[PDB]
Design an enzyme around this catalytic site. Structure first.
Site, PDB file in Angstrom:
ATOM      1  N   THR A   1       0.599  -1.249  -0.103  1.00  0.00           N
ATOM      2  CA  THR A   1      -0.046  -0.068  -0.146  1.00  0.00           C
ATOM      3  C   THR A   1       0.913   1.261  -0.157  1.00  0.00           C
ATOM      4  O   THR A   1       1.729   1.387   0.915  1.00  0.00           O
ATOM      5  CB  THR A   1      -1.016  -0.047   1.263  1.00  0.00           C
ATOM      6  OG1 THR A   1      -1.555  -0.974   1.388  1.00  0.00           O
ATOM      7  CG2 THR A   1      -1.731   1.276   1.295  1.00  0.00           C
TER       8      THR A   1
ATOM      9  N   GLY B   1      -4.431   0.916   5.260  1.00  0.00           N
ATOM     10  CA  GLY B   1      -4.688  -0.010   6.506  1.00  0.00           C
ATOM     11  C   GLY B   1      -5.652  -0.909   6.457  1.00  0.00           C
ATOM     12  O   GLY B   1      -5.542  -1.820   5.368  1.00  0.00           O
TER      13      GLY B   1
ATOM     14  N   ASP C   1      -1.533   2.831  -5.606  1.00  0.00           N
ATOM     15  CA  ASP C   1      -1.362   1.590  -6.600  1.00  0.00           C
ATOM     16  C   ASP C   1      -2.483   0.805  -6.418  1.00  0.00           C
ATOM     17  O   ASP C   1      -3.547   1.315  -5.956  1.00  0.00           O
ATOM     18  CB  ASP C   1       0.039   1.032  -5.848  1.00  0.00           C
ATOM     19  CG  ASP C   1      -0.291   0.730  -4.292  1.00  0.00           C
ATOM     20  OD1 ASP C   1      -1.081   1.309  -3.820  1.00  0.00           O
ATOM     21  OD2 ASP C   1       0.563  -0.433  -3.872  1.00  0.00           O
TER      22      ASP C   1
ATOM     23  N   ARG D   1      -2.954  -3.047  -5.289  1.00  0.00           N
ATOM     24  CA  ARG D   1      -2.648  -4.136  -4.778  1.00  0.00           C
ATOM     25  C   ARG D   1      -3.314  -4.211  -3.405  1.00  0.00           C
ATOM     26  O   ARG D   1      -3.359  -3.526  -2.765  1.00  0.00           O
ATOM     27  CB  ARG D   1      -1.295  -4.549  -4.773  1.00  0.00           C
ATOM     28  CG  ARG D   1      -0.742  -5.356  -5.901  1.00  0.00           C
ATOM     29  CD  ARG D   1       0.569  -5.402  -6.074  1.00  0.00           C
ATOM     30  NE  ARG D   1       1.074  -6.487  -5.037  1.00  0.00           N
ATOM     31  CZ  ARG D   1       2.328  -6.756  -4.968  1.00  0.00           C
ATOM     32  NH1 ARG D   1       3.203  -6.347  -5.704  1.00  0.00           N
ATOM     33  NH2 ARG D   1       2.757  -7.679  -4.075  1.00  0.00           N
TER      34      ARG D   1
ATOM     35  N   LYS E   1      -8.095   2.466  -4.787  1.00  0.00           N
ATOM     36  CA  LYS E   1      -7.887   2.875  -3.445  1.00  0.00           C
ATOM     37  C   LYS E   1      -8.465   4.221  -3.142  1.00  0.00           C
ATOM     38  O   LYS E   1      -8.338   4.763  -1.943  1.00  0.00           O
ATOM     39  CB  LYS E   1      -6.451   2.577  -2.962  1.00  0.00           C
ATOM     40  CG  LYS E   1      -5.734   1.475  -2.950  1.00  0.00           C
ATOM     41  CD  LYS E   1      -4.453   1.152  -2.502  1.00  0.00           C
ATOM     42  CE  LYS E   1      -3.951  -0.233  -2.443  1.00  0.00           C
ATOM     43  NZ  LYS E   1      -2.461  -0.392  -2.328  1.00  0.00           N
TER      44      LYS E   1
ATOM     45  N   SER F   1       3.224  -3.763  -2.498  1.00  0.00           N
ATOM     46  CA  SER F   1       2.835  -2.613  -3.064  1.00  0.00           C
ATOM     47  C   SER F   1       3.359  -3.353  -4.719  1.00  0.00           C
ATOM     48  O   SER F   1       4.070  -4.052  -5.041  1.00  0.00           O
ATOM     49  CB  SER F   1       3.554  -1.488  -2.950  1.00  0.00           C
ATOM     50  OG  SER F   1       2.954  -1.045  -1.734  1.00  0.00           O
TER      51      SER F   1
ATOM     52  N   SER G   1       2.293   1.409   3.631  1.00  0.00           N
ATOM     53  CA  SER G   1       3.479   0.887   4.020  1.00  0.00           C
ATOM     54  C   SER G   1       4.734   1.080   3.440  1.00  0.00           C
ATOM     55  O   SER G   1       5.886   1.165   3.929  1.00  0.00           O
ATOM     56  CB  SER G   1       3.217  -0.947   3.670  1.00  0.00           C
ATOM     57  OG  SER G   1       3.137  -1.164   2.275  1.00  0.00           O
TER      58      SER G   1
ATOM     59  N   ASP H   1       8.911  -1.745  -2.241  1.00  0.00           N
ATOM     60  CA  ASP H   1       8.111  -2.328  -1.178  1.00  0.00           C
ATOM     61  C   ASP H   1       7.518  -3.601  -1.754  1.00  0.00           C
ATOM     62  O   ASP H   1       7.047  -3.871  -2.869  1.00  0.00           O
ATOM     63  CB  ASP H   1       7.023  -1.483  -0.758  1.00  0.00           C
ATOM     64  CG  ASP H   1       6.277  -1.870   0.465  1.00  0.00           C
ATOM     65  OD1 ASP H   1       6.758  -1.916   1.543  1.00  0.00           O
ATOM     66  OD2 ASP H   1       5.115  -2.485   0.156  1.00  0.00           O
TER      67      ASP H   1
END
Lengths: 240, 220, 250, 239, 240, 232, 228, 204
Positions: free
Chosen positions: B1, B47, B17, B19, B33, B169, B129, B166
């Site tokens: 995220t 979250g 993104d 995912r 998102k 993500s 994240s 990351d």
């Protein structure tokens, strides 16, 4: 008829009679006057001796709400000390929540909204009491308010509630309360309530006085005996 | 995220993104998102994906109720005040990290809301994240009062830093540009990563699977 | 506050109570519904009231309400009070199905609603419902059933009953033309068009003035069919062909 | 919540909402019950059938347990909710003390439910009277009745409903010891009782006997057609 | 025209009227008072009179002008006990707008919330529906000044010039001839055309001790109450 | 405090709820309003006259939107209308938070009329004094419904509410057919509101709102002047 | 026209308390006599029908093993007060491990007797006699629908109350025995009832210091009748 | 864990103008089967099914709470439910137990009733809907089912090759799982008819 039983109904000309009927019950209580001096407020209540069997100091029509706030009542005495309990309790919530002593423009606002709240519903009746609130602060001076059973409050330089209301406040405006200190006021408070209540209606009566200001160091208390004896010495010179 | 936002010379650009990773397995490859709040305010979510859906629909229901009653345009400080008062009431049991942005009458406003109820107005924020990777692109290459071509190039560059660095993500980059008169919501802004083509033909035919019992029921 | 209380719960000095009798006085006017069964199938014949030329004619029904997946009801009286009862026993049947995983028997659905209806006549200081209504349906215990509710709270099983404005005239003719267990679901339809030929003072039997819905048992279906306005009038004229034949030949 | 005293006193000492509810009982259909020494027999009259209704949904004799039957008068909507509250209590007796419910126990529950309900706030009283009939443990057949004010009260023979004073006057001049001699002879007292009432000439009566070990067993209109023949046949030859 | 208890509680007459509300409109008229509000091109002016019949009464505690929020002022007519209770609600409802929504309440949204509360009194058959009126002023962004009235029936509308009280119809007939000739309105002309409203209806031609004027303008959006000295400046310029 | 907890609406001995019959008298003395659906959208038109020139006509509105695609007008008394608007604004939201879908116009009238029936039986309340007209285009086909203070509802093609409503319904019966466009229904809604208005029907004496498949919207007084021009 | 249930008269008493005093003048008569040997306590039954079972009704009922009761006026609401008295004597035994005295039973009931209203609905229309033997010997109390109780020595309550009290003041003295107090009561009941006196129209109960509450039955009862 | 107490696996897969759903048949307690005919796919109207997998209590509990709310919907409204609408209905039901949650993961597959277009989605145990275009999977043996579907799915597939793909996806993955098996039932729906088949799997 039928338009005057509950306090929830208007009349066909738009007024509430249950409040007006409770205003009529005030003029059977005797007389309570209170004027403020330049630097304090002086109350005064003439007290009818109903019989010899009662004790001198009974059933005081002159309460003590807070450390600096005083109350003089006129009306049905059971409702008087019931309003005195919520006003004594309202000032305790101010000091506990906000830290300091309650001002009079807020105290008489909270009480009058509590009195107004019983002029709306059919489940409760309006109060049968009118009363006065007076105090002194070092940052605000002397204050003097008065509350009717409808719930209306105003400021006053001097007021009167009881049987002879206009016959009392006629002589109050003969005084000059803007410049007198609260010492010679005490003699003038008593004098205007000797000229009222002819001895045909009552045989004998009792003087009861109250007193607040910076001469009392802000605290509310009763007058001493010797000072009100001077006013009772200044009683029988109104025969000239 | 990885979600991010910026304030350029006229409006606000938001990016994310696509995912959703359950455990360590990629569950969704095209999860949107960026959410609707009002015709001028959007929000990005991070979250717990169930807590951010049921929160962003409650506030967007109340602002539709509020603006239709007042008859005028919502403000960004109203959506800030509704969110942080209800997240504080649930004491942080609702995990919802939000990037709030919109252009009201007073101008563009960008907020970041943490799941205990702490907020802050900032010219650029990153959450998620891989937010630390996306912050370094903003921290090196931010300039006040950019044009929207420079802003859209900056945000897509910062989201790509959260893609290639990351683990949780990395897919097609969403963007949305809010201005005083234009709302450009566009999900496939770029395709950084594809899927490789199949080589071996695995194709089965009808009759290669044994069936015990079959039933046919017609409809109309 | 006790001067304004109207005391809708107390008895009268003659013994009966006035409030539900005023409601059952109002249940006579404003509507006409009837049902019939003797064999496989059961029907609800209801007469429409507002026949003004500016209406959309939608919602699949006017006074017919599907309650369960295998039973329905026809209502009479205050229509606004009806909408509260109809979506009240609609979820009485569903909370039964949640509890037992079985469709509800048609009789104990009626007793469940007629206890809610009885409670307002008995305490609370509350206006009772001026609503009486019919019940058709099927269950595995007894087959096709036909019930009738009253605003007092007491129900009853029947075979053919009307709650119309001339309902006494309809019942007097239903027990003049009837047969126990032999009226198939074509003779009952011809008998249904005969009865509301009488009780409807608007003559000539406009096909848009009535509504007929049938409940037939298909194997796992229990088909509740509201028959359309293309097959009413051919059933209307079929009653008209035989009455000119029977009058002239007698 | 509706808080209002419905039942209050009169200025001379009556409860008007109670005795108004007793007149709602006094025009319901007649229910008669006697007890034999081994078989109780009670049967309502005035079925008032209109030959287009289901005959089982109009019944006024139900059962509370296997041993306790119950008939009533008054208005039916108040009846079947008192019955359903009695079915719960007699079932909750078995989760308690193990034996089945004695017939005296279930009358005290109905009578005490009915009294306190003439005492609460915002409630009209019930408008029913009942006959509770059972043969308890150790085979002692007995019956009771229940006034709408809530006074439970045992009897040897009784009748309630429209035309109950004339039937009660008929029974005292007719209730002998040998009238309860045979189980078919006690039935000839009931069929002679309700025929001395609103007409019901075999077409509006439904007797239902209980032989102290069975459940209720309603005889169909073939034995009542047989019994009313022979009850009138003995009347045909003597007079 | 009457059947049942429709004279006593808030239910419908056979004519569709309901009398307890239209009894309450003429409970406003028993105050013996009249207030005028005039909206200008860039300002809003409330003018009203005050009648102090006593010398013993404190003249600083009879203000019918009240400050609701920092930028919203109002004037109260009708009886005093119900009017001061309704100000206490409006102070409370504006603070909850700021806490829930984070910005200053518009003056039409506040008048909606007061009228929704007043609706409930004529909606239940138990409460007495608060026989006093309500006039608000305020500056709104992208709307300029705007004036609203709320009556005890639950109705409200935005006005351009407003009268309320005993002499309502005579004042509005004066103002509607003034506004439809469509002169432009500066600051002082709206002060002049509001004083000359109740100076020609009531026919007083007073000194500055009997009226009180609140104002708001888009250069100082604070609701402010004029000093008697600067009231006199507009008054002697009104006498050319 | 507390309430009364008893119904002040009882059955007459003739079997009629008298307070609901009196509430329909207050509805009939309201401002006249007509509503017409024709094959692509619904036209709602009302009649709003300020009592004097002092009132600001751009302050309140008769025609109100409920959602993106549902509008609602009335003919009755004022303060009762704003209560069940704010009720119906909320009811469209709890449908949306469950189902994530704009509410059908039929299901709104299922729930608004359930409020009005619940309010004429409960303790200590007088019924509402308004009747409603509700429009909307759900799944292509438009809808036009009318409620009443009793709690019932209907499905009209064209109807009138307010003063002289029995004359408007005769006028619409001789005017309306199945095949009209939206701009034709606007022209015949002004032609039926001219039956009962005063002499001057300006751009601010009336208030018109329409539905399309583009959604509900409310007309500005610019094009309302163009429709009022070349009329009658 | 319709007052509330809680209204004073211009003469100051109440309305429905005073109306409930009138209601116990319709009940069957009952006599209790306190004697230092023990408390005897009798009643009639007022049998209505020959078909009626006579023993199903009762007026004497026991509260505890040493306290009996006698009810008049209405009956159906007397059973509410009896059940509150039985529970109260068992809570006192549970918490104090002794027997509640006869006087303290009565004020435990008399506090309940005036509690109606419109919150939390009419006064009880019964009248009670409480006979018992506590540690101060035999006792006899009498309560009211008003909740006023006082110890009596020979109290007669029912429809023939004031007719019996006059004939009871002449024969009572402070040194009776129980064998003659039982006989003196049935002489009074023979006058005031309608039907003839036998072993089924009446029933008695006596409480003693020695034994517990004993109720007579139809075998030992008619030896008093045949030797009247 | 909690989800591993009874096992289970539900797969849905989208085709050309048709959609198929499949599930296993085993009911057991952690090592020990009890029966091999446990229903895990439930019908919700024509051409619209739902699959449930997780704790065996909440499989039978949610499938009865949902039917309670579904029949009230289809009687208050005169039409059948859209597949997108039921996804919001189920997500509302699970989020009410935000802190008392049901231990199940639903899978919804069906055709849109007016325009016959397939629809698939899946939800977590607290109601996060995720619509896809190829396949959704739920249950204990999730990772084995991703290796099947990512390797075998084709975009536009007739109902014959759609059946053979979802059959080989279930038989090979569930055989690799221990707490799932004992037979596979396959529902494949389309606009004209519907088909229920059971496969010849390992009873091992």
């Amino acid at each position: 008829t039928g338009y005057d039983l509950s306090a929830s109904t208007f009349s066909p000309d738009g007024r509430v009679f249950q409040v007006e009927y409770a205003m009529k019950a005030v003029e059977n209580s005797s007389t309570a006057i209170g004027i403020r001096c330049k630097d304090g407020v002086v109350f005064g209540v003439e007290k009818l001796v109903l019989s010899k069997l009662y004790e001198e100091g009974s059933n005081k029509r002159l309460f003590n709400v807070d450390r600096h706030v005083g109350m003089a009542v006129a009306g049905l005495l059971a409702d008087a000390r019931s309003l005195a309990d919520i006003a004594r309790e309202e000032a305790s919530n101010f000091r506990s929540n906000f830290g300091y002593n309650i001002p009079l423009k807020h105290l008489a606002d909270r009480v009058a909204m509590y009195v107004h709240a019983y002029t709306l519903y059919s489940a409760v009746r309006p109060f049968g009491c009118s009363f006065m609130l007076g105090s002194y602060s070092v940052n605000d001076g002397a204050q003097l308010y008065m509350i009717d059973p409808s719930g209306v409050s105003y400021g006053y330089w001097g007021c009167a509630i009881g049987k002879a209301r206009q016959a009392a406040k006629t002589e109050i405006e003969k005084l000059q309360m803007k410049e007198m200190t609260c010492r010679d006021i005490v003699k003038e408070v008593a004098k205007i309530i000797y000229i009222v209540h002819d001895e045909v209606k009552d045989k004998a009566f009792e003087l009861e006085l109250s007193w607040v200001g910076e001469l009392t160091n802000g605290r509310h208390e009763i007058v001493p005996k010797d000072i009100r004896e001077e006013a009772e010495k200044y009683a029988k010179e109104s025969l000239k | 995220t990885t979600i991010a936002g910026v304030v350029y010379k006229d409006g606000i650009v938001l990016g994310a993104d696509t995912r959703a990773t359950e455990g360590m397995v990629v569950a969704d490859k095209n999860c949107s998102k960026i959410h609707f709040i009002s015709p001028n305010i959007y929000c990005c979510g991070a979250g717990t994906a169930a807590d951010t859906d049921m929160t962003t629909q409650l506030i967007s229901s109340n602002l539709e109720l509020h603006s239709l009653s007042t008859g005028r345009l919502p403000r960004v400080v109203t959506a800030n005040r509704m969110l942080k008062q209800m997240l504080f009431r649930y004491q942080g049991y609702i995990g919802a990290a939000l990037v709030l942005g919109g252009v009201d009458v007073t101008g563009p406003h960008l907020y970041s809301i943490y799941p205990h109820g702490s907020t802050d107005k900032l010219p650029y924020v990153t959450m998620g994240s891989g937010s630390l990777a996306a912050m370094a692109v903003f921290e090196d290459k931010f300039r006040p009062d950019m044009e929207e071509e420079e802003a859209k190039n900056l945000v897509s560059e910062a989201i790509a830093a959260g893609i290639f660095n990351d683990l949780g993500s990395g897919s097609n980059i969403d963007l949305c540009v809010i201005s005083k008169n234009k709302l450009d919501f566009l999900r496939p802004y770029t395709v950084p990563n594809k899927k490789g083509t199949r080589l071996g033909r695995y194709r089965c035919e009808k009759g290669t699977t044994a069936v015990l019992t079959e039933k046919i029921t017609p409809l109309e | 506050s006790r001067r304004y209380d109207s005391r809708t719960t107390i008895f009268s000095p003659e013994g009966r109570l006035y409030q539900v009798e005023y409601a059952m006085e109002a249940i006579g006017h404003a509507g006409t519904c009837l049902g019939i069964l003797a064999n496989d199938g059961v029907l609800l014949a209801a007469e429409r009231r507002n026949i003004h030329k500016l209406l959309d004619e939608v919602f699949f029904s006017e006074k017919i309400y599907k309650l369960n997946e295998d039973m329905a009801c026809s209502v009479a009286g205050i229509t606004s009070d009806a909408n509260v009862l109809t979506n009240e026993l609609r979820l009485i049947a569903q909370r039964y199905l949640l509890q037992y995983q079985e469709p509800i028997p048609c009789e104990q659905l009626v007793t469940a609603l007629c206890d809610i209806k009885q409670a307002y006549t008995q305490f609370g200081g509350k206006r009772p419902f001026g609503v009486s209504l019919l019940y058709i349906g099927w269950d595995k215990h007894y087959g096709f059933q036909l019930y009738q509710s009253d605003p007092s709270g007491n129900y009853g099983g029947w075979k053919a009953t009307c709650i119309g404005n001339n309902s006494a005239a309809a019942v007097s003719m239903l027990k003049q033309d009837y047969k126990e267990g032999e009226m198939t679901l074509k003779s009952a339809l011809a008998l249904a068009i005969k009865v509301l030929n009488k009780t409807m003072d608007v003559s000539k039997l406009s096909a848009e003035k009535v509504e007929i819905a049938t409940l037939t048992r298909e194997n796992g279906k229990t088909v509740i069919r509201v028959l359309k306005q293309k097959e009413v009038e051919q059933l209307i004229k079929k009653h008209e062909e035989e009455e000119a034949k029977a009058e002239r030949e007698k | 919540s509706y808080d209002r005293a419905i039942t209050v006193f009169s200025p001379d000492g009556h409860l008007f909402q109670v005795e108004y509810a007793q007149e709602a009982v006094k025009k319901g259909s007649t229910a008669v019950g006697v007890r034999g020494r081994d078989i109780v027999v009670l049967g309502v009259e005035k079925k008032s059938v209109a030959k287009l209704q289901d005959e089982r949904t109009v019944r006024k004799i139900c059962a509370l347990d296997d041993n306790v039957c119950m008939a009533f008068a008054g208005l039916t909507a108040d009846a079947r909710i008192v019955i359903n509250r009695a079915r719960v209590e007699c079932q909750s007796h078995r989760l308690t003390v193990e034996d089945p419910v004695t017939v005296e126990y279930i009358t005290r529950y109905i009578a005490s439910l009915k009294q306190r309900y003439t005492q609460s706030n915002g409630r009209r009283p019930f408008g029913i009277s009942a006959l509770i009939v059972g043969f308890d443990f150790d085979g002692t057949p007995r019956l009771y009745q229940t006034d709408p004010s809530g006074t439970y009260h045992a009897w040897k023979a009784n009748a309630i409903g429209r035309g109950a004073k004339s039937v009660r006057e008929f029974l005292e001049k007719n209730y002998t010891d040998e009238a309860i001699e045979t189980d078919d002879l006690t039935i000839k007292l009931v069929i002679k009782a309700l025929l001395e009432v609103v007409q019901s000439g075999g077409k509006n009566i439904e007797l239902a006997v209980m032989r102290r070990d069975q459940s209720l067993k309603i005889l169909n209109p073939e034995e009542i057609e047989k019994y009313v023949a022979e009850i009138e046949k003995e009347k045909e030859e003597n007079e | 025209s009457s059947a049942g208890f429709d004279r006593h509680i808030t239910i419908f007459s056979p004519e569709g009227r309901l009398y307890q509300v239209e009894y309450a409109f003429k409970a406003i008229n028993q105050g013996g008072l009249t207030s005028v509000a005039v909206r200008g091109k860039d300002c809003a002016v409330i003018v009203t009179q005050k009648k102090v019949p006593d010398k013993l009464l404190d003249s600083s505690t009879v203000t019918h002008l009240f400050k609701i929020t920092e930028n919203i002022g109002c004037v109260m007519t009708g009886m005093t006990a119900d009017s001061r209770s309704q100000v206490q609600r409006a102070r409370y409802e504006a603070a909850n707008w700021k806490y829930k929504y984070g910005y200053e309440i518009p003056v039409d949204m506040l008048c909606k919330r007061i009228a929704d509360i007043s609706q409930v009194y004529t909606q239940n058959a138990e409460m007495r529906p608060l026989g006093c009126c309500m006039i608000l002023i305020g500056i709104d962004e992208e709307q300029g000044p705007q004036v609203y009235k709320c009556d005890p029936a639950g109705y409200y509308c935005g006005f351009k010039a407003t009268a309320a009280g005993v002499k309502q119809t005579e004042s509005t007939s004066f103002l509607e001839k003034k506004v439809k000739k469509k002169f432009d309105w500066t600051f002082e002309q709206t002060v002049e055309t509001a004083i000359t409203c109740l100076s020609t209806v009531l026919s007083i031609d007073f000194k500055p001790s009997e009226i009180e004027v609140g104002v708001v303008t888009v250069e100082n959006p604070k609701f402010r109450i004029l000093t008697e000295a600067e009231i006199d400046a507009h008054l002697v310029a009104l006498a050319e | 405090e507390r309430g009364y907890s008893f119904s002040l609406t009882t059955f007459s001995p003739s079997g009629k709820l008298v307070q609901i019959e009196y509430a329909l008298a207050a509805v009939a003395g309201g401002a006249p309003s007509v509503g017409i659906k024709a094959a692509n959208g619904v036209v709602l038109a009302t009649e709003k006259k300020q009592k004097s020139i002092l009132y600001d006509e751009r302050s309140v509105h008769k025609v109100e939107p409920i959602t993106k695609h549902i509008g609602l007008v009335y003919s009755g008394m004022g303060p009762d209308y704003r209560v069940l608007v704010h009720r119906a604004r909320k009811l469209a939201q709890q449908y949306y938070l469950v189902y994530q879908e704009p509410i059908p116009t039929a299901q709104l009238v299922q729930r608004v009329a359930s409020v009005m029936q619940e309010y004429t039986q409960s303790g200590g309340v007088r019924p509402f004094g308004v009747s409603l007209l509700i429009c909307g285009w759900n799944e292509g086909r438009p809808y036009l419904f009318q409620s009443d203070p009793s709690g019932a509802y209907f499905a009209w093609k064209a109807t009138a509410m307010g003063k002289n409503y029995v004359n408007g319904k005769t006028f619409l019966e001789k005017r309306y057919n199945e095949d009209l466009e939206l701009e034709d229904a606007i022209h015949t809604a002004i032609l039926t509101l001219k039956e009962s208005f005063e002499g001057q029907m300006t751009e601010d004496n009336i208030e018109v709102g329409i539905c399309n498949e583009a959604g509900f919207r409310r007309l500005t007084p610019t094009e309302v002047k163009d429709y009022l021009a070349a009329i009658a | 026209y319709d007052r509330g249930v809680n209204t004073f008269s211009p003469e100051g008493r109440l309305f429905q308390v005073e109306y409930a005093i009138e209601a116990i003048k319709l009940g069957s008569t009952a006599i209790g006599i306190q004697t230092s040997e023990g408390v005897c306590l009798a009643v009639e039954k007022r049998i209505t029908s020959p078909l009626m079972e006579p023993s199903s009704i009762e007026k004497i009922v026991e509260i505890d093993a040493h306290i009996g009761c006698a009810m008049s006026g209405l009956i159906a609401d007397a059973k509410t007060l009896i059940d509150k008295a039985r529970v109260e004597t068992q809570n006192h035994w549970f918490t104090y491990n002794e027997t509640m005295t006869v006087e303290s039973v009565t004020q435990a009931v008399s506090n309940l007797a005036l509690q109606f209203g419109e919150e939390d609905s009419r006064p009880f229309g019964v009248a009670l006699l409480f006979g018992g033997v506590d540690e101060k010997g035999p006792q006899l109390f009498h309560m009211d629908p008003s909740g006023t109780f006082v110890q009596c020595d020979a109290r007669a309550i029912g429809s023939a109350s004031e007719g019996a009290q006059s004939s009871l003041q002449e024969v009572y003295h402070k040194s009776m025995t129980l064998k003659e107090a039982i006989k003196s009561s049935l002489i009074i009941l023979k006058q005031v009832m309608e039907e003839k006196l036998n072993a089924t129209n009446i029933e008695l109960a006596t409480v003693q210091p020695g034994q517990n509450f004993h109720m007579f039955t139809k075998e030992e009862l008619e030896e008093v009748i045949k030797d009247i | 864990s909690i989800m591993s107490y009874n096992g289970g696996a539900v797969m849905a897969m989208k085709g050309k103008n048709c959609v198929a759903i499949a599930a296993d048949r085993r009911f057991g307690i952690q090592a020990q089967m009890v029966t091999t005919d446990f229903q895990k796919i439930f019908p919700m109207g024509d051409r619209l099914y739902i699959g449930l997998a997780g704790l065996a209590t909440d499989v039978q509990t949610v499938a009865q709470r949902l039917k309670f709310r579904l029949n009230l919907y289809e009687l208050k409204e005169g039409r059948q439910i859209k597949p997108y609408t039921l996804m919001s209905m189920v997500a509302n039901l699970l989020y009410e137990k935000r802190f008392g949650p049901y231990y199940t993961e639903p899978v919804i597959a069906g055709l849109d009733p007016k325009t016959f277009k397939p629809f698939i989605c899946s939800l977590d145990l607290i109601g996060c809907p995720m619509v896809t275009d190829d396949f959704v999977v739920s249950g204990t043996c999730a990772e084995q089912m991703y290796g099947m579907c990512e390797s075998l799915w084709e975009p536009n597939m007739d109902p014959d090759h759609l059946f053979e793909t979802i059959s080989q996806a279930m038989l090979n993955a569930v055989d690799r799982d221990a707490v799932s098996g004992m037979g596979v039932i396959v529902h494949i729906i389309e606009k004209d008819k519907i088909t229920t088949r059971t496969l010849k799997a390992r009873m091992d």
